Protein backbone atom coordinates (compact mmCIF):
# COMPACT_ATOMS: atom_id res chain seq x y z
CA UNK A 1 0.00 0.00 0.00
CA UNK A 2 0.90 3.73 0.14
CA UNK A 3 1.94 6.40 2.64
CA UNK A 4 0.77 10.00 2.18
CA UNK A 5 0.91 13.28 4.16
CA UNK A 6 -1.80 15.37 2.38
CA UNK A 7 -1.41 18.98 1.34
CA UNK A 8 -1.73 21.82 3.81
CA UNK A 9 -2.07 25.61 3.94
CA UNK A 10 1.13 27.71 4.15
CA UNK A 11 0.64 28.77 7.82
CA UNK A 12 1.45 25.52 9.66
CA UNK A 13 4.68 25.18 7.64
CA UNK A 14 5.17 28.94 7.94
CA UNK A 15 5.27 29.08 11.73
CA UNK A 16 7.13 25.79 11.85
CA UNK A 17 9.82 27.56 9.87
CA UNK A 18 9.73 30.72 12.00
CA UNK A 19 11.27 28.54 14.68
CA UNK A 20 14.15 27.80 12.26
CA UNK A 21 14.90 31.36 11.12
CA UNK A 22 16.85 32.66 14.20
CA UNK A 23 19.43 29.89 13.86
CA UNK A 24 20.27 31.09 10.34
CA UNK A 25 22.21 33.98 11.99
CA UNK A 26 24.21 31.88 14.48
CA UNK A 27 27.35 30.87 12.55
CA UNK A 28 29.64 29.97 15.46
CA UNK A 29 31.02 26.47 15.02
CA UNK A 30 29.39 25.74 18.42
CA UNK A 31 25.96 26.20 16.75
CA UNK A 32 26.35 25.48 13.01
CA UNK A 33 23.81 22.77 12.20
CA UNK A 34 24.02 21.01 8.80
CA UNK A 35 20.76 19.15 9.50
CA UNK A 36 19.05 22.53 9.49
CA UNK A 37 20.47 23.55 6.09
CA UNK A 38 19.40 20.21 4.62
CA UNK A 39 15.82 20.42 5.87
CA UNK A 40 15.36 23.94 4.64
CA UNK A 41 16.52 23.06 1.11
CA UNK A 42 14.32 19.92 1.13
CA UNK A 43 11.32 22.02 2.34
CA UNK A 44 8.63 24.28 0.98
CA UNK A 45 10.42 27.19 2.69
CA UNK A 46 13.61 29.17 2.28
CA UNK A 47 15.62 31.93 3.96
CA UNK A 48 17.02 33.46 0.78
CA UNK A 49 20.45 35.05 0.84
CA UNK A 50 20.98 33.74 4.37
CA UNK A 51 21.21 30.17 3.03
CA UNK A 52 24.38 30.91 1.11
CA UNK A 53 26.05 32.51 4.13
CA UNK A 54 24.88 29.54 6.20
CA UNK A 55 26.39 27.05 3.75
CA UNK A 56 29.60 29.06 3.49
CA UNK A 57 29.99 28.99 7.29
CA UNK A 58 29.70 25.20 7.23
CA UNK A 59 32.20 24.79 4.35
CA UNK A 60 34.42 27.09 6.41
CA UNK A 61 34.20 25.52 9.85
CA UNK A 62 33.97 21.90 8.79
CA UNK A 63 36.77 22.03 6.20
CA UNK A 64 39.14 24.09 8.38
CA UNK A 65 38.71 22.08 11.58
CA UNK A 66 39.12 18.66 9.99
CA UNK A 67 41.71 19.38 7.25
CA UNK A 68 43.94 21.96 8.95
CA UNK A 69 40.40 24.23 16.29
CA UNK A 70 38.21 24.06 19.42
CA UNK A 71 37.27 20.38 19.16
CA UNK A 72 35.06 18.63 16.63
CA UNK A 73 33.21 18.75 14.33
CA UNK A 74 32.14 15.08 14.88
CA UNK A 75 32.35 12.40 12.21
CA UNK A 76 28.57 12.04 12.34
CA UNK A 77 28.27 15.76 11.88
CA UNK A 78 30.58 15.38 8.90
CA UNK A 79 28.03 12.98 7.40
CA UNK A 80 25.33 15.66 7.74
CA UNK A 81 27.71 18.16 6.15
CA UNK A 82 27.85 15.91 3.08
CA UNK A 83 24.05 15.82 2.92
CA UNK A 84 24.16 19.60 2.95
CA UNK A 85 26.44 19.45 -0.08
CA UNK A 86 23.88 17.35 -1.96
CA UNK A 87 21.19 19.74 -0.70
CA UNK A 88 22.96 22.42 -2.76
CA UNK A 89 23.35 20.12 -5.81
CA UNK A 90 27.07 19.48 -5.23
CA UNK A 91 29.16 16.32 -5.09
CA UNK A 92 31.92 16.31 -2.53
CA UNK A 93 34.80 17.10 -4.76
CA UNK A 94 38.38 18.19 -5.08
CA UNK A 95 41.37 17.80 -2.84
CA UNK A 96 39.68 18.99 0.33
CA UNK A 97 36.61 17.02 -0.70
CA UNK A 98 38.45 13.75 -1.31
CA UNK A 99 40.14 13.93 2.09
CA UNK A 100 36.86 14.50 3.94
CA UNK A 101 35.40 11.35 2.40
CA UNK A 102 38.39 9.22 3.38
CA UNK A 103 38.05 10.55 6.95
CA UNK A 104 34.41 9.52 7.07
CA UNK A 105 35.41 6.13 5.66
CA UNK A 106 37.95 5.76 8.46
CA UNK A 107 35.15 6.42 10.92
CA UNK A 108 33.08 3.63 9.38
CA UNK A 109 36.24 1.49 9.57
CA UNK A 110 37.16 2.20 13.23
CA UNK A 111 33.56 1.52 14.25
CA UNK A 112 33.66 -1.76 12.31
CA UNK A 113 36.77 -2.89 14.17
CA UNK A 114 35.31 -2.05 17.58
CA UNK A 115 32.20 -4.11 16.83
CA UNK A 116 34.33 -7.25 16.23
CA UNK A 117 30.71 -5.33 21.08
CA UNK A 118 29.09 -1.97 20.43
CA UNK A 119 30.15 0.97 18.29
CA UNK A 120 31.71 3.91 20.10
CA UNK A 121 29.02 6.23 18.83
CA UNK A 122 25.75 4.64 17.67
CA UNK A 123 24.25 2.46 14.99
CA UNK A 124 22.40 5.65 14.03
CA UNK A 125 25.64 7.52 13.36
CA UNK A 126 26.93 4.38 11.63
CA UNK A 127 24.09 4.20 9.07
CA UNK A 128 24.07 7.97 8.77
CA UNK A 129 27.69 7.75 7.65
CA UNK A 130 27.05 5.00 5.10
CA UNK A 131 24.09 6.99 3.71
CA UNK A 132 26.05 10.22 3.20
CA UNK A 133 28.78 8.33 1.35
CA UNK A 134 26.18 6.51 -0.77
CA UNK A 135 24.60 9.87 -1.57
CA UNK A 136 27.84 11.06 -3.16
CA UNK A 137 28.11 7.66 -4.95
CA UNK A 138 31.17 6.76 -2.86
CA UNK A 139 31.26 3.06 -2.02
CA UNK A 140 32.00 1.34 1.29
CA UNK A 141 33.21 -2.24 1.55
CA UNK A 142 30.74 -5.09 1.90
CA UNK A 143 32.23 -5.77 5.37
CA UNK A 144 31.22 -2.23 6.43
CA UNK A 145 27.62 -2.76 5.33
CA UNK A 146 27.62 -6.06 7.22
CA UNK A 147 27.79 -4.43 10.66
CA UNK A 148 24.61 -2.48 9.90
CA UNK A 149 23.01 -5.54 8.27
CA UNK A 150 23.39 -7.70 11.38
CA UNK A 151 22.14 -4.94 13.74
CA UNK A 152 18.59 -5.57 12.43
CA UNK A 153 19.95 -5.98 21.09
CA UNK A 154 16.91 -3.72 20.70
CA UNK A 155 16.77 -0.45 18.72
CA UNK A 156 14.66 2.69 18.64
CA UNK A 157 12.47 3.63 15.64
CA UNK A 158 14.96 6.36 14.66
CA UNK A 159 17.81 3.85 14.56
CA UNK A 160 15.95 1.40 12.34
CA UNK A 161 14.63 4.35 10.28
CA UNK A 162 18.15 5.64 9.58
CA UNK A 163 19.41 2.13 8.85
CA UNK A 164 16.53 1.84 6.41
CA UNK A 165 17.57 5.03 4.68
CA UNK A 166 21.15 3.76 4.37
CA UNK A 167 19.99 0.48 2.82
CA UNK A 168 17.47 2.13 0.48
CA UNK A 169 20.32 4.19 -0.94
CA UNK A 170 22.50 1.13 -1.38
CA UNK A 171 19.72 -0.65 -3.30
CA UNK A 172 18.64 2.29 -5.50
CA UNK A 173 22.35 2.94 -6.26
CA UNK A 174 23.05 -0.79 -6.92
CA UNK A 175 25.91 -0.44 -4.46
CA UNK A 176 27.36 -3.40 -2.59
CA UNK A 177 25.76 -5.89 -5.04
CA UNK A 178 27.55 -8.62 -3.07
CA UNK A 179 24.79 -8.25 -0.45
CA UNK A 180 21.85 -7.20 -2.67
CA UNK A 181 19.53 -9.90 -1.37
CA UNK A 182 20.43 -9.05 2.21
CA UNK A 183 19.86 -5.28 1.88
CA UNK A 184 16.33 -6.01 0.71
CA UNK A 185 15.64 -8.37 3.62
CA UNK A 186 17.00 -5.66 5.90
CA UNK A 187 14.81 -3.03 4.22
CA UNK A 188 11.82 -5.33 4.56
CA UNK A 189 12.49 -6.10 8.22
CA UNK A 190 13.20 -2.45 9.04
CA UNK A 191 9.70 -1.73 7.72
CA UNK A 192 8.07 -4.48 9.78
CA UNK A 193 9.81 -3.22 12.95
CA UNK A 194 8.66 0.45 12.57
CA UNK A 195 4.99 -0.61 12.18
CA UNK A 196 5.20 -2.73 15.39
CA UNK A 197 6.41 0.32 17.26
CA UNK A 198 3.24 2.25 16.43
CA UNK A 199 1.75 3.69 19.67
CA UNK A 200 -2.05 3.71 20.16
CA UNK A 201 -2.03 7.49 19.63
CA UNK A 202 -0.69 6.77 16.12
CA UNK A 203 3.03 7.62 16.43
CA UNK A 204 5.92 5.29 15.43
CA UNK A 205 7.13 4.97 19.06
CA UNK A 206 7.37 8.75 19.67
CA UNK A 207 6.20 11.96 17.91
CA UNK A 208 9.92 12.74 17.26
CA UNK A 209 10.53 9.25 15.78
CA UNK A 210 7.56 9.73 13.30
CA UNK A 211 9.33 12.25 10.88
CA UNK A 212 12.22 9.89 10.19
CA UNK A 213 9.97 6.84 10.24
CA UNK A 214 7.84 8.58 7.59
CA UNK A 215 10.87 9.52 5.45
CA UNK A 216 11.93 5.86 5.40
CA UNK A 217 8.35 4.63 4.91
CA UNK A 218 7.87 7.14 2.11
CA UNK A 219 10.57 5.50 -0.03
CA UNK A 220 9.51 1.82 -0.24
CA UNK A 221 6.05 0.51 -1.35
CA UNK A 222 -0.84 -1.65 7.56
CA UNK A 223 1.12 0.64 5.26
CA UNK A 224 -1.45 3.29 4.37
CA UNK A 225 -3.76 2.74 7.37
CA UNK A 226 -0.68 3.10 9.63
CA UNK A 227 0.41 6.16 7.61
CA UNK A 228 -3.01 7.76 8.02
CA UNK A 229 -2.83 6.95 11.70
CA UNK A 230 0.60 8.58 11.59
CA UNK A 231 -0.63 11.77 9.91
CA UNK A 232 -3.48 12.42 12.36
CA UNK A 233 -1.01 11.75 15.17
CA UNK A 234 1.57 14.06 13.67
CA UNK A 235 -1.00 16.79 12.85
CA UNK A 236 -2.51 16.82 16.37
CA UNK A 237 0.94 17.25 17.89
CA UNK A 238 1.77 20.15 15.58
CA UNK A 239 -1.38 21.91 16.74
CA UNK A 240 -0.34 21.14 20.31
CA UNK A 241 2.97 22.72 19.18
CA UNK A 242 5.19 19.72 19.94
CA UNK A 243 7.92 20.72 17.45
CA UNK A 244 10.16 23.41 19.00
CA UNK A 245 13.58 21.78 18.53
CA UNK A 246 15.44 23.00 15.45
CA UNK A 247 16.83 19.56 14.53
CA UNK A 248 13.39 17.99 14.92
CA UNK A 249 11.88 20.75 12.82
CA UNK A 250 14.59 20.09 10.25
CA UNK A 251 13.76 16.37 10.05
CA UNK A 252 10.05 17.07 9.75
CA UNK A 253 9.96 19.79 7.07
CA UNK A 254 11.14 17.38 4.29
CA UNK A 255 8.19 15.12 5.04
CA UNK A 256 5.77 18.06 4.87
CA UNK A 257 7.21 18.82 1.44
CA UNK A 258 7.00 15.15 0.32
CA UNK A 259 10.77 14.60 0.38
CA UNK A 260 13.24 12.34 2.20
CA UNK A 261 17.02 12.25 2.50
CA UNK A 262 17.00 9.76 -0.39
CA UNK A 263 15.79 12.56 -2.68
CA UNK A 264 19.30 13.97 -2.35
CA UNK A 265 20.36 11.35 -4.93
CA UNK A 266 18.69 13.72 -7.45
CA UNK A 267 18.64 17.16 -5.88
CA UNK A 268 16.07 19.75 -7.05
CA UNK A 269 17.67 23.06 -6.15
CA UNK A 270 15.42 25.17 -8.41
CA UNK A 271 11.88 24.30 -7.25
CA UNK A 272 10.61 27.57 -5.73
CA UNK A 273 10.27 27.97 -1.99
CA UNK A 274 8.22 30.35 0.14
CA UNK A 275 10.35 33.05 1.75
CA UNK A 276 10.49 32.83 5.55
CA UNK A 277 10.02 36.10 7.39
CA UNK A 278 10.88 36.61 11.14
CA UNK A 279 6.97 38.09 29.72
CA UNK A 280 5.11 36.15 32.46
CA UNK A 281 4.60 37.24 36.05
CA UNK A 282 4.24 33.78 37.56
CA UNK A 283 6.83 31.97 39.65
CA UNK A 284 6.58 28.19 39.67
CA UNK A 285 8.37 25.64 41.81
CA UNK A 286 9.96 22.54 40.31
CA UNK A 287 11.41 19.75 42.38
CA UNK A 288 14.67 18.57 40.77
CA UNK A 289 15.76 15.14 41.85
CA UNK A 290 18.70 12.69 41.48
CA UNK A 291 18.52 9.17 42.93
CA UNK A 292 21.30 7.36 41.08
CA UNK A 293 23.74 8.90 43.58
CA UNK A 294 23.94 8.43 47.34
CA UNK A 295 22.78 10.25 49.34
CA UNK A 296 20.08 11.35 46.88
CA UNK A 297 19.52 14.99 45.98
CA UNK A 298 15.93 16.25 45.97
CA UNK A 299 15.07 19.96 46.13
CA UNK A 300 12.40 22.41 45.05
CA UNK A 301 13.70 25.26 42.89
CA UNK A 302 11.78 28.48 42.22
CA UNK A 303 12.00 29.88 38.69
CA UNK A 304 9.70 31.87 36.38
CA UNK A 305 7.02 29.91 34.54
CA UNK A 306 7.92 28.94 31.01
CA UNK A 307 11.47 28.18 32.18
CA UNK A 308 13.15 25.06 30.84
CA UNK A 309 14.77 22.22 32.74
CA UNK A 310 18.00 23.96 31.80
CA UNK A 311 16.76 27.09 33.58
CA UNK A 312 16.15 25.02 36.70
CA UNK A 313 19.57 23.34 36.72
CA UNK A 314 21.32 26.73 36.47
CA UNK A 315 19.29 27.98 39.43
CA UNK A 316 20.00 24.85 41.50
CA UNK A 317 23.68 25.46 40.80
CA UNK A 318 23.45 29.16 41.78
CA UNK A 319 21.72 28.46 45.12
CA UNK A 320 24.56 26.09 46.10
CA UNK A 321 25.19 22.38 46.37
CA UNK A 322 24.31 21.22 42.85
CA UNK A 323 26.57 20.86 39.81
CA UNK A 324 26.15 19.48 36.31
CA UNK A 325 27.97 19.67 32.98
CA UNK A 326 26.59 19.85 29.44
CA UNK A 327 28.10 19.53 25.97
CA UNK A 328 26.94 21.02 22.66
CA UNK A 329 25.13 18.89 20.09
CA UNK A 330 23.13 19.53 16.99
CA UNK A 331 19.99 19.21 19.17
CA UNK A 332 21.11 21.61 21.88
CA UNK A 333 22.76 21.14 25.28
CA UNK A 334 23.39 17.47 26.10
CA UNK A 335 23.66 16.53 29.81
CA UNK A 336 27.02 14.79 30.34
CA UNK A 337 27.80 15.00 34.06
CA UNK A 338 25.59 15.49 37.11
CA UNK A 339 27.04 16.18 40.58
CA UNK A 340 30.55 15.29 39.48
CA UNK A 341 29.55 11.89 38.07
CA UNK A 342 29.89 11.70 34.30
CA UNK A 343 28.13 9.24 32.06
CA UNK A 344 30.43 6.35 31.38
CA UNK A 345 30.61 4.22 28.28
CA UNK A 346 27.19 2.86 27.28
CA UNK A 347 25.78 5.17 29.98
CA UNK A 348 23.71 8.29 29.90
CA UNK A 349 22.02 10.69 32.28
CA UNK A 350 18.33 10.21 31.43
CA UNK A 351 15.68 12.86 32.13
CA UNK A 352 12.28 11.87 33.51
CA UNK A 353 9.12 13.35 34.90
CA UNK A 354 6.52 11.95 37.23
CA UNK A 355 5.65 8.98 37.12
CA UNK A 356 8.97 7.29 36.07
CA UNK A 357 8.26 8.45 32.50
CA UNK A 358 11.20 9.51 30.28
CA UNK A 359 10.99 12.94 28.73
CA UNK A 360 10.85 13.22 24.96
CA UNK A 361 12.76 16.53 24.98
CA UNK A 362 16.04 17.75 26.39
CA UNK A 363 16.99 20.09 29.14
CA UNK A 364 16.58 23.19 26.95
CA UNK A 365 13.25 22.32 25.34
CA UNK A 366 11.19 20.75 28.15
CA UNK A 367 9.28 23.39 30.11
CA UNK A 368 8.06 21.93 33.43
CA UNK A 369 4.67 22.81 34.84
CA UNK A 370 4.39 24.20 38.35
CA UNK A 371 4.91 21.26 40.70
CA UNK A 372 6.38 18.68 38.33
CA UNK A 373 9.27 16.69 39.70
CA UNK A 374 12.16 16.21 37.24
CA UNK A 375 14.60 13.32 37.57
CA UNK A 376 18.16 13.03 36.32
CA UNK A 377 19.04 9.35 36.24
CA UNK A 378 22.29 7.58 35.35
CA UNK A 379 21.04 4.69 33.21
CA UNK A 380 22.79 2.06 31.13
CA UNK A 381 22.00 1.65 27.43
CA UNK B 1 35.96 44.14 3.89
CA UNK B 2 37.58 40.75 4.83
CA UNK B 3 39.87 40.21 7.89
CA UNK B 4 43.65 40.05 7.40
CA UNK B 5 43.84 36.23 7.42
CA UNK B 6 41.25 35.55 4.70
CA UNK B 7 40.96 36.23 0.94
CA UNK B 8 37.64 37.64 -0.30
CA UNK B 9 36.14 36.08 -3.44
CA UNK B 10 35.80 38.82 -6.02
CA UNK B 11 32.25 38.03 -7.14
CA UNK B 12 30.54 36.43 -4.16
CA UNK B 13 32.15 38.86 -1.72
CA UNK B 14 32.75 36.09 0.81
CA UNK B 15 35.75 35.32 2.96
CA UNK B 16 38.05 32.35 2.34
CA UNK B 17 41.23 31.39 4.24
CA UNK B 18 44.55 31.83 2.49
CA UNK B 19 45.16 28.08 2.90
CA UNK B 20 42.54 27.91 0.12
CA UNK B 21 44.20 30.43 -2.20
CA UNK B 22 46.03 28.41 -4.89
CA UNK B 23 45.33 24.83 -3.77
CA UNK B 24 43.92 23.55 -7.13
CA UNK B 25 40.41 23.55 -5.62
CA UNK B 26 37.72 26.02 -6.67
CA UNK B 27 36.40 27.33 -3.36
CA UNK B 28 34.98 30.62 -4.61
CA UNK B 29 31.98 30.66 -6.92
CA UNK B 30 33.98 32.20 -9.78
CA UNK B 31 37.38 30.70 -8.96
CA UNK B 32 39.16 33.90 -7.84
CA UNK B 33 41.26 31.84 -5.42
CA UNK B 34 42.70 29.76 -8.26
CA UNK B 35 42.99 32.39 -10.99
CA UNK B 36 45.79 35.05 -11.09
CA UNK B 37 47.67 32.27 -9.35
CA UNK B 38 51.20 30.74 -9.30
CA UNK B 39 56.45 3.96 11.08
CA UNK B 40 55.02 1.04 9.06
CA UNK B 41 51.51 -0.11 8.18
CA UNK B 42 49.56 -3.14 9.39
CA UNK B 43 48.74 -6.58 8.01
CA UNK B 44 45.70 -5.97 5.80
CA UNK B 45 46.73 -2.41 4.94
CA UNK B 46 48.65 -0.77 2.11
CA UNK B 47 51.01 2.19 1.74
CA UNK B 48 50.43 5.04 -0.68
CA UNK B 49 53.47 5.01 -2.94
CA UNK B 50 54.40 8.72 -2.58
CA UNK B 51 52.81 9.59 0.80
CA UNK B 52 53.17 8.08 4.28
CA UNK B 53 49.43 7.46 4.77
CA UNK B 54 48.18 3.91 5.33
CA UNK B 55 44.86 2.69 3.91
CA UNK B 56 43.17 -0.73 4.28
CA UNK B 57 43.64 -2.95 1.24
CA UNK B 58 39.85 -2.74 0.73
CA UNK B 59 40.05 0.94 -0.24
CA UNK B 60 42.30 -0.09 -3.15
CA UNK B 61 40.26 0.05 -6.41
CA UNK B 62 37.00 1.18 -4.84
CA UNK B 63 36.23 4.19 -7.02
CA UNK B 64 37.57 6.84 -4.69
CA UNK B 65 41.15 8.17 -4.45
CA UNK B 66 41.91 7.54 -0.76
CA UNK B 67 45.59 8.53 -1.18
CA UNK B 68 46.72 12.11 -1.89
CA UNK B 69 48.55 10.88 -5.02
CA UNK B 70 45.52 8.69 -5.99
CA UNK B 71 47.80 5.65 -6.19
CA UNK B 72 45.17 3.37 -4.65
CA UNK B 73 43.18 3.77 -7.83
CA UNK B 74 46.01 3.70 -10.41
CA UNK B 75 46.24 0.13 -11.63
CA UNK B 76 42.52 -0.66 -11.73
CA UNK B 77 41.20 -2.23 -14.93
CA UNK B 78 44.37 -4.22 -15.71
CA UNK B 79 46.48 -6.88 -14.04
CA UNK B 80 49.43 -5.26 -12.26
CA UNK B 81 50.66 -2.09 -14.10
Amino acid at each position, epitope marked *: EMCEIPEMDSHLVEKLGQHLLPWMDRLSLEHLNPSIYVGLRLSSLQAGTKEDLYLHSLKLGYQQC*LL*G*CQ*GKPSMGQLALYLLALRANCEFVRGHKGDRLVSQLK*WFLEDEKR*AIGGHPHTSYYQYGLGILALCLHQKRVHDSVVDKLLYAVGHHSVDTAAMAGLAFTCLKRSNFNPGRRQRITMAIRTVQEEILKAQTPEGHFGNVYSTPLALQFLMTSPELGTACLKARVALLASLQDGAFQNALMISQLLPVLNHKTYIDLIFPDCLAPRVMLEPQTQEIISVTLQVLSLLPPYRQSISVLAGSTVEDVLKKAHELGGFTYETQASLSGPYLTSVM*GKAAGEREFWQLLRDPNTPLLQGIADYRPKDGETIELRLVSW | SCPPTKFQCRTSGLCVPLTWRCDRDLDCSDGSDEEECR*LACLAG*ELRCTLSDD*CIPLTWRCDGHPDCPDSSDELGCGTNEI
Partner: nanobody
Amino acid sequence: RQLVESGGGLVQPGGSLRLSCAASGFTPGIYDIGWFRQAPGKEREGVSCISSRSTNYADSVKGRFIISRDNVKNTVYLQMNSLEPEDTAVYYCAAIYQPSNGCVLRPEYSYWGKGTPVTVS
Protein backbone atom coordinates in the same frame (compact mmCIF):
# COMPACT_ATOMS: atom_id res chain seq x y z
CA ARG C 1 43.71 -4.70 19.71
CA GLN C 2 44.70 -2.65 22.80
CA LEU C 3 47.50 -0.55 24.18
CA VAL C 4 49.94 -1.22 27.03
CA GLU C 5 51.54 1.15 29.54
CA SER C 6 54.90 0.72 31.26
CA GLY C 7 57.86 2.74 32.48
CA GLY C 8 56.24 3.50 35.83
CA GLY C 9 57.82 3.01 39.23
CA LEU C 10 58.83 4.49 42.55
CA VAL C 11 60.91 7.69 42.57
CA GLN C 12 61.51 10.55 45.05
CA PRO C 13 60.50 14.19 44.39
CA GLY C 14 62.58 16.17 41.94
CA GLY C 15 63.00 13.02 39.84
CA SER C 16 62.53 11.89 36.26
CA LEU C 17 60.29 9.23 34.75
CA ARG C 18 59.29 8.00 31.30
CA LEU C 19 55.94 6.31 30.64
CA SER C 20 55.61 4.20 27.54
CA CYS C 21 52.32 3.76 25.70
CA ALA C 22 52.95 1.06 23.09
CA ALA C 23 50.10 0.73 20.58
CA SER C 24 49.43 -2.49 18.70
CA GLY C 25 46.69 -2.69 16.09
CA PHE C 26 46.30 1.03 15.34
CA THR C 27 47.03 2.60 11.89
CA PRO C 28 49.98 5.01 12.53
CA GLY C 29 48.69 8.34 11.41
CA ILE C 30 45.02 8.48 12.26
CA TYR C 31 44.35 8.41 16.03
CA ASP C 32 44.76 10.90 18.82
CA ILE C 33 46.69 9.40 21.75
CA GLY C 34 46.58 10.88 25.24
CA TRP C 35 47.79 10.20 28.76
CA PHE C 36 45.34 10.24 31.68
CA ARG C 37 45.98 9.98 35.41
CA GLN C 38 43.61 8.80 38.17
CA ALA C 39 44.89 9.30 41.75
CA PRO C 40 43.29 7.24 44.57
CA GLY C 41 40.00 8.88 45.51
CA LYS C 42 39.90 11.26 42.53
CA GLU C 43 38.25 11.60 39.10
CA ARG C 44 40.40 10.80 36.06
CA GLU C 45 42.11 13.94 34.74
CA GLY C 46 43.52 14.78 31.32
CA VAL C 47 47.28 15.18 31.36
CA SER C 48 48.69 15.39 27.85
CA CYS C 49 47.94 14.30 24.31
CA ILE C 50 49.59 14.06 20.89
CA SER C 51 47.78 15.16 17.76
CA SER C 52 46.62 12.93 14.90
CA ARG C 53 47.97 14.91 11.96
CA SER C 54 50.54 19.17 17.68
CA THR C 55 50.40 19.02 21.49
CA ASN C 56 48.04 19.96 24.34
CA TYR C 57 48.97 20.08 28.05
CA ALA C 58 46.83 20.47 31.15
CA ASP C 59 48.49 23.57 32.78
CA SER C 60 49.12 21.70 36.01
CA VAL C 61 51.72 19.93 33.86
CA LYS C 62 52.90 23.03 31.92
CA GLY C 63 56.65 22.70 31.47
CA ARG C 64 56.77 19.47 33.49
CA PHE C 65 55.72 16.44 31.41
CA ILE C 66 56.18 16.37 27.62
CA ILE C 67 54.66 13.90 25.06
CA SER C 68 56.50 12.51 21.98
CA ARG C 69 56.30 9.64 19.43
CA ASP C 70 59.12 7.18 18.48
CA ASN C 71 59.24 6.86 14.71
CA VAL C 72 60.15 3.12 14.57
CA LYS C 73 58.00 2.05 17.62
CA ASN C 74 54.40 3.47 17.10
CA THR C 75 54.68 4.19 20.85
CA VAL C 76 54.12 7.59 22.55
CA TYR C 77 56.21 8.63 25.57
CA LEU C 78 55.16 10.89 28.43
CA GLN C 79 58.49 12.12 29.78
CA MET C 80 58.12 13.23 33.39
CA ASN C 81 60.17 16.05 34.92
CA SER C 82 60.26 18.09 38.15
CA LEU C 83 58.30 15.56 40.17
CA GLU C 84 56.09 16.57 43.11
CA PRO C 85 53.94 14.42 45.42
CA GLU C 86 50.49 15.00 43.84
CA ASP C 87 51.73 13.56 40.51
CA THR C 88 51.29 10.18 42.22
CA ALA C 89 48.69 8.02 40.46
CA VAL C 90 48.19 5.20 38.02
CA TYR C 91 48.62 6.42 34.46
CA TYR C 92 46.51 5.32 31.48
CA CYS C 93 46.99 5.98 27.79
CA ALA C 94 44.07 5.98 25.34
CA ALA C 95 43.20 6.09 21.63
CA ILE C 96 40.43 7.97 19.75
CA TYR C 97 39.66 8.80 16.11
CA GLN C 98 38.92 12.54 15.97
CA PRO C 99 40.61 14.19 13.03
CA SER C 100 39.52 17.54 14.45
CA ASN C 101 42.62 19.66 14.68
CA GLY C 102 43.70 19.19 18.22
CA CYS C 103 43.64 16.31 20.51
CA VAL C 104 41.32 16.82 23.45
CA LEU C 105 42.00 16.64 27.19
CA ARG C 106 38.40 15.84 28.19
CA PRO C 107 38.10 12.15 29.11
CA GLU C 108 36.25 10.91 26.02
CA TYR C 109 38.56 8.52 24.19
CA SER C 110 37.41 5.21 22.83
CA TYR C 111 40.27 2.76 23.45
CA TRP C 112 41.75 2.60 26.93
CA GLY C 113 44.84 0.95 28.35
CA LYS C 114 45.46 -0.97 31.56
CA GLY C 115 47.32 1.76 33.41
CA THR C 116 50.83 1.59 34.83
CA PRO C 117 51.40 2.46 38.51
CA VAL C 118 53.58 5.49 39.21
CA THR C 119 54.08 6.40 42.87
CA VAL C 120 56.27 9.09 44.50
CA SER C 121 57.31 9.72 48.15
